[PDB]
Amino acid sequence: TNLVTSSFNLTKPMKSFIRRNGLRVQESVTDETDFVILGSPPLRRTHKFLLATSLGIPLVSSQYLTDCIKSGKVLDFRSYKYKDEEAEAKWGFRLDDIHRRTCFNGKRLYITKAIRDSMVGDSIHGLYSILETSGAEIVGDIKRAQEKDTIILAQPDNDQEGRNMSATGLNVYKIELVALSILRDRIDFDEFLID
Amino acid sequence: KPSQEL
């Protein structure tokens, strides 16, 4: 059984239990991941969380591992499904909606230069990773993006490519489209339209 | 360093 941790630091005893009970920690979420252990609420909307959600992988409370240790056995992770009603109301989604997302399957997306430059580090890496794992293709250049079959993600202000596309008649959208769409398994385009 | 949120 394969697991990933997000916003949670594993202790040495936890790693010992894992080593001995035929569990394995992974560096990244993949289609072979069985569940993701999340740090205590409030839920943090990390790359790993969004990948797990996109791929239909259950989210599990950290308490699971401690309780496993206390019982000596691998408990059922299902007793420990992650719960956070506040996040559910805040972002408008269900944690019990555990299934592979299809909303980005076959979609073409373009992320403006402003976004690519202005998210140095993990943020944009998680963006590209989530999109391609979710079945989307990133178009090769802004010219190809200037088509109605492409979702253009831009910054609402201070985005020259964004404004230039708007001035063609093309709609451009805020980056949040990606995360919330994954959470909802639906793209609510109007919510994220920049104008 | 902390896992970034999107």
Numbering used by the authors:
A (entry chain A): 387 to 581
B (entry chain C): 127 to 132
Task: Give the exact sentences the study uses for this entry.
The high affinity interaction between γH2AX and the tandem BRCT domain pair (BRCT2) module at the C-terminus of MDC1 (0.4 μM, in vitro) is a key step in the amplification and spreading of the γH2AX signal via recruitment of MRN and ATM, which in metazoan cells also facilitates recruitment of 53BP1 and the associated Shieldin complex to DNA double strand breaks, through ubiquitylation of histone H2A. Although no MDC1 homologue is evident in S.cerevisiae, Mdb1 in S.pombe has a similar molecular architecture and shares the ability of MDC1 to interact with the equivalent γH2A modification via its C-terminal BRCT2 module. Surprisingly, despite strong conservation on both sides, no interaction was observed between the single SDT motif present in Mdb1, the S.pombe homologue of MDC1, and any part of Rad4, the S.pombe homologue of TOPBP1.
Since its discovery, phosphorylation of the most C-terminal serine residue (Ser 139) in the histone H2A variant H2AX has become the definitive biomarker for the presence of DNA double-strand breaks (DSBs) in mammalian cells. Comparable phosphorylations of closely related C-terminal motifs are also observed in both of the yeast species commonly used in genome stability studies, Saccharomyces cerevisiae and Schizosaccharomyces pombe but here the phosphorylation occurs on the normal histone H2A isoform rather than a specialised variant. This, and the earlier demonstrations of phosphorylation-dependent interactions of BRCA1 and PTIP, highlighted the key role played by BRCT domains in mediating interactions between proteins involved in the DNA damage response. Critical to the ability of BRCT domains to recognise the phosphorylated status of ligand peptides, are a triplet of amino acids (Ser548, Arg558 and Lys619 in Crb2) which make multiple hydrogen binding and charge-neutralising interactions with the negatively-charged phosphate group of the phosphorylated peptide.
